[PDB]
Write a protein that binds this ligand. Structure first.
Ligand SMILES: COc1ccc(S(=O)(=O)N(CC(C)C)C[C@@H](O)[C@H](Cc2cc(F)cc(F)c2)NC(=O)O[C@H]2CCO[C@H]3OCC[C@H]32)cc1
Lengths: 99, 99
């Protein structure tokens, strides 16, 4: 798809058997998801944003289906206010900025 | 241009007579610039992100030249760690997401 930006660029994702909505976020290096039940190992990590830092759980090699595209990579889980698909996954679905 | 997302989507902007680099950020509703000397009158505001909130100064009808394209709109100035071009200006330069 081509997505204009008059509204937030939200897409439906499937991850860990659950359906969610997430923001396609070119400003995010990494993918950060709201508190959710994810299976497997995880490493504690801290990540920084506009208002400070949050502690997240890092999961690697996690499969996400984003608007019918499959990607695998690192997902961070924690107290983000919105689900963010970051550049680590955007590159896998071939996403580009155009103007 | 078309911009792939293997690196951060940075562009050069000119605002208030100064040259800066800023991130093309589809996850940002509004445009947020690091502390800088802007001439106008401003309104106090708070904005929220991943780690909490920051106080910013809101300036309206600010001219920004983003990668040569000209845009006018609201700019927020405050303790953001990265200069962020948000959707309020991205729409003016015709920016779209494509995959
Ligand atoms: C009123 O209108 C607004 C304008 C901006 C923001 S907002 O807090 O800024 N936000 C919106 C929110 C969905 C996260 C945009 C997002 O694009 C930031 C933009 C950014 C980049 C940055 F490098 C440093 C920042 F402080 C902020 N991304 C980031 O928080 O990323 C985190 C985690 C992912 O991985 C990493 O990637 C980069 C940093 C880290 C809010 C309101």
């Amino acid at each position: 798809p081509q997505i204009t930006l008059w509204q937030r660029p939200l897409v439906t994702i499937k991850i860990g058997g659950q359906l969610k909505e997430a923001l396609l976020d070119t400003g995010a290096d990494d993918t950060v998801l709201e508190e959710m039940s994810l299976p497997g190992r995880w490493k504690p990590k801290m990540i920084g944003g506009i208002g400070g830092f949050i502690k997240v759980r890092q999961y690697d090699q996690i499969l996400i289906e984003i608007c019918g595209h499959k990607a695998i990579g690192t997902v961070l889980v924690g107290p983000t206010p919105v689900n963010i698909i970051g550049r680590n996954l955007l590159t896998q679905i071939g996403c580009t900025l155009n103007f």
